[PDB]
Amino acid sequence: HHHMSHYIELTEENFESTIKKGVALVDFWAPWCGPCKMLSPVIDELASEYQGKAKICKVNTDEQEELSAKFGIRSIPTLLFTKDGEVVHQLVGVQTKVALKEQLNKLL
């Protein structure tokens, strides 16, 4: 029984085409980051709850240095909200599920 991934792993190759259309939430994280691991289950739940309605994505900053530099990530967790390929909000820290849902719904 492996771990299940409801989220979309983003990379330099697939980033632009993945968020080109629709509403996306992008979680910049790293496997050594305590607050990132605290935020991870909320991203799993949102990815499942918003399946087919919004793109819930993750960027591993250890593996995607060019993407994190592209958005000026200096701290993680960083949560990025995009609509139709354009950045709308960029939040830092262990955001609450409620606040993330509301921001998603507003964009939807």
PDB file of C-alpha atoms in Angstrom:
ATOM      1  CA  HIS A   1       0.000   0.000   0.000  1.00  0.00           C
ATOM      2  CA  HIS A   2       2.045   2.924  -1.372  1.00  0.00           C
ATOM      3  CA  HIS A   3       1.376   6.563  -0.620  1.00  0.00           C
ATOM      4  CA  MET A   4      -1.214   8.140  -2.918  1.00  0.00           C
ATOM      5  CA  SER A   5      -0.551  11.441  -4.705  1.00  0.00           C
ATOM      6  CA  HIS A   6      -3.627  13.539  -5.485  1.00  0.00           C
ATOM      7  CA  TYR A   7      -1.419  16.553  -6.187  1.00  0.00           C
ATOM      8  CA  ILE A   8       0.393  17.431  -9.402  1.00  0.00           C
ATOM      9  CA  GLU A   9       4.173  17.424  -9.170  1.00  0.00           C
ATOM     10  CA  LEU A  10       5.400  20.493 -11.059  1.00  0.00           C
ATOM     11  CA  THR A  11       8.744  20.655 -12.830  1.00  0.00           C
ATOM     12  CA  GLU A  12      10.507  23.095 -15.115  1.00  0.00           C
ATOM     13  CA  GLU A  13       9.174  21.116 -18.090  1.00  0.00           C
ATOM     14  CA  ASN A  14       5.501  20.854 -17.149  1.00  0.00           C
ATOM     15  CA  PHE A  15       5.026  24.047 -15.117  1.00  0.00           C
ATOM     16  CA  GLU A  16       3.799  26.501 -17.756  1.00  0.00           C
ATOM     17  CA  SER A  17       1.428  24.100 -19.527  1.00  0.00           C
ATOM     18  CA  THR A  18       0.003  22.785 -16.228  1.00  0.00           C
ATOM     19  CA  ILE A  19      -1.119  26.194 -14.898  1.00  0.00           C
ATOM     20  CA  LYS A  20      -1.859  27.810 -18.287  1.00  0.00           C
ATOM     21  CA  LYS A  21      -5.621  27.404 -17.785  1.00  0.00           C
ATOM     22  CA  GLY A  22      -7.785  27.397 -14.687  1.00  0.00           C
ATOM     23  CA  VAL A  23      -7.155  27.883 -10.995  1.00  0.00           C
ATOM     24  CA  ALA A  24      -4.024  26.408  -9.418  1.00  0.00           C
ATOM     25  CA  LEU A  25      -2.552  26.327  -5.928  1.00  0.00           C
ATOM     26  CA  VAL A  26       1.191  25.633  -5.885  1.00  0.00           C
ATOM     27  CA  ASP A  27       2.927  24.561  -2.661  1.00  0.00           C
ATOM     28  CA  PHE A  28       6.701  25.083  -2.618  1.00  0.00           C
ATOM     29  CA  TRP A  29       8.155  22.571  -0.134  1.00  0.00           C
ATOM     30  CA  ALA A  30      11.200  20.437   0.678  1.00  0.00           C
ATOM     31  CA  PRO A  31      11.520  17.059   2.442  1.00  0.00           C
ATOM     32  CA  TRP A  32      13.662  18.478   5.285  1.00  0.00           C
ATOM     33  CA  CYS A  33      11.231  21.270   6.219  1.00  0.00           C
ATOM     34  CA  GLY A  34       9.198  20.838   9.398  1.00  0.00           C
ATOM     35  CA  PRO A  35       6.441  23.345   8.610  1.00  0.00           C
ATOM     36  CA  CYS A  36       6.245  21.931   5.072  1.00  0.00           C
ATOM     37  CA  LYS A  37       5.530  18.473   6.469  1.00  0.00           C
ATOM     38  CA  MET A  38       2.927  20.090   8.755  1.00  0.00           C
ATOM     39  CA  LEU A  39       1.223  21.633   5.711  1.00  0.00           C
ATOM     40  CA  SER A  40       1.463  18.531   3.482  1.00  0.00           C
ATOM     41  CA  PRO A  41      -1.740  16.716   4.610  1.00  0.00           C
ATOM     42  CA  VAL A  42      -3.811  19.852   3.968  1.00  0.00           C
ATOM     43  CA  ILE A  43      -2.479  19.947   0.405  1.00  0.00           C
ATOM     44  CA  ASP A  44      -3.376  16.262  -0.035  1.00  0.00           C
ATOM     45  CA  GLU A  45      -6.921  16.883   1.205  1.00  0.00           C
ATOM     46  CA  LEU A  46      -7.360  19.942  -1.018  1.00  0.00           C
ATOM     47  CA  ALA A  47      -6.012  18.072  -4.059  1.00  0.00           C
ATOM     48  CA  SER A  48      -8.585  15.335  -3.488  1.00  0.00           C
ATOM     49  CA  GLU A  49     -11.464  17.692  -2.646  1.00  0.00           C
ATOM     50  CA  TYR A  50     -10.800  19.955  -5.654  1.00  0.00           C
ATOM     51  CA  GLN A  51     -10.052  17.161  -8.135  1.00  0.00           C
ATOM     52  CA  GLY A  52     -11.441  18.269 -11.484  1.00  0.00           C
ATOM     53  CA  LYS A  53     -12.168  21.804 -10.241  1.00  0.00           C
ATOM     54  CA  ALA A  54      -8.690  23.160  -9.479  1.00  0.00           C
ATOM     55  CA  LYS A  55      -5.071  22.114  -9.940  1.00  0.00           C
ATOM     56  CA  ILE A  56      -3.362  21.477  -6.603  1.00  0.00           C
ATOM     57  CA  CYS A  57       0.370  21.270  -7.206  1.00  0.00           C
ATOM     58  CA  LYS A  58       3.687  20.901  -5.400  1.00  0.00           C
ATOM     59  CA  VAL A  59       7.189  22.134  -6.243  1.00  0.00           C
ATOM     60  CA  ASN A  60      10.040  20.388  -4.420  1.00  0.00           C
ATOM     61  CA  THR A  61      12.593  23.173  -4.008  1.00  0.00           C
ATOM     62  CA  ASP A  62      15.454  20.665  -3.666  1.00  0.00           C
ATOM     63  CA  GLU A  63      14.659  19.325  -7.152  1.00  0.00           C
ATOM     64  CA  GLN A  64      13.264  22.453  -8.862  1.00  0.00           C
ATOM     65  CA  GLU A  65      15.785  25.217  -8.116  1.00  0.00           C
ATOM     66  CA  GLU A  66      14.955  27.058 -11.348  1.00  0.00           C
ATOM     67  CA  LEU A  67      11.241  27.228 -10.521  1.00  0.00           C
ATOM     68  CA  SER A  68      11.766  28.503  -6.988  1.00  0.00           C
ATOM     69  CA  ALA A  69      14.163  31.143  -8.308  1.00  0.00           C
ATOM     70  CA  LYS A  70      11.579  32.029 -10.975  1.00  0.00           C
ATOM     71  CA  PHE A  71       9.151  33.024  -8.201  1.00  0.00           C
ATOM     72  CA  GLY A  72      11.724  34.372  -5.754  1.00  0.00           C
ATOM     73  CA  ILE A  73      11.171  31.735  -3.092  1.00  0.00           C
ATOM     74  CA  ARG A  74      13.284  32.722  -0.098  1.00  0.00           C
ATOM     75  CA  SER A  75      11.119  30.920   2.459  1.00  0.00           C
ATOM     76  CA  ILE A  76       9.109  27.694   2.518  1.00  0.00           C
ATOM     77  CA  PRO A  77       6.281  26.824   2.753  1.00  0.00           C
ATOM     78  CA  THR A  78       5.326  29.234  -0.015  1.00  0.00           C
ATOM     79  CA  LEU A  79       1.816  28.913  -1.422  1.00  0.00           C
ATOM     80  CA  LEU A  80       1.179  30.341  -4.869  1.00  0.00           C
ATOM     81  CA  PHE A  81      -2.304  31.002  -6.260  1.00  0.00           C
ATOM     82  CA  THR A  82      -2.549  31.289 -10.052  1.00  0.00           C
ATOM     83  CA  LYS A  83      -5.461  31.958 -12.390  1.00  0.00           C
ATOM     84  CA  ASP A  84      -5.152  31.439 -16.164  1.00  0.00           C
ATOM     85  CA  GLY A  85      -1.362  31.335 -15.859  1.00  0.00           C
ATOM     86  CA  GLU A  86      -1.017  34.603 -13.891  1.00  0.00           C
ATOM     87  CA  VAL A  87       0.066  34.779 -10.250  1.00  0.00           C
ATOM     88  CA  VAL A  88      -2.718  36.176  -8.045  1.00  0.00           C
ATOM     89  CA  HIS A  89      -1.476  35.718  -4.459  1.00  0.00           C
ATOM     90  CA  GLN A  90       1.731  34.457  -2.865  1.00  0.00           C
ATOM     91  CA  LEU A  91       1.467  33.383   0.778  1.00  0.00           C
ATOM     92  CA  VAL A  92       4.126  32.191   3.206  1.00  0.00           C
ATOM     93  CA  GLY A  93       3.914  29.830   6.169  1.00  0.00           C
ATOM     94  CA  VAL A  94       1.555  27.154   7.475  1.00  0.00           C
ATOM     95  CA  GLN A  95      -1.639  28.474   5.906  1.00  0.00           C
ATOM     96  CA  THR A  96      -4.934  27.158   7.230  1.00  0.00           C
ATOM     97  CA  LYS A  97      -7.065  24.854   5.116  1.00  0.00           C
ATOM     98  CA  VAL A  98     -10.071  27.167   5.568  1.00  0.00           C
ATOM     99  CA  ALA A  99      -8.229  30.210   4.227  1.00  0.00           C
ATOM    100  CA  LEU A 100      -6.872  28.220   1.281  1.00  0.00           C
ATOM    101  CA  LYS A 101     -10.350  26.880   0.423  1.00  0.00           C
ATOM    102  CA  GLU A 102     -11.877  30.367   0.477  1.00  0.00           C
ATOM    103  CA  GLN A 103      -9.164  31.755  -1.787  1.00  0.00           C
ATOM    104  CA  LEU A 104      -9.707  28.823  -4.158  1.00  0.00           C
ATOM    105  CA  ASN A 105     -13.478  29.317  -4.182  1.00  0.00           C
ATOM    106  CA  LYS A 106     -13.094  33.051  -4.845  1.00  0.00           C
ATOM    107  CA  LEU A 107     -10.959  32.280  -7.899  1.00  0.00           C
ATOM    108  CA  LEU A 108     -13.456  29.591  -8.999  1.00  0.00           C
TER     109      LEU A 108
END
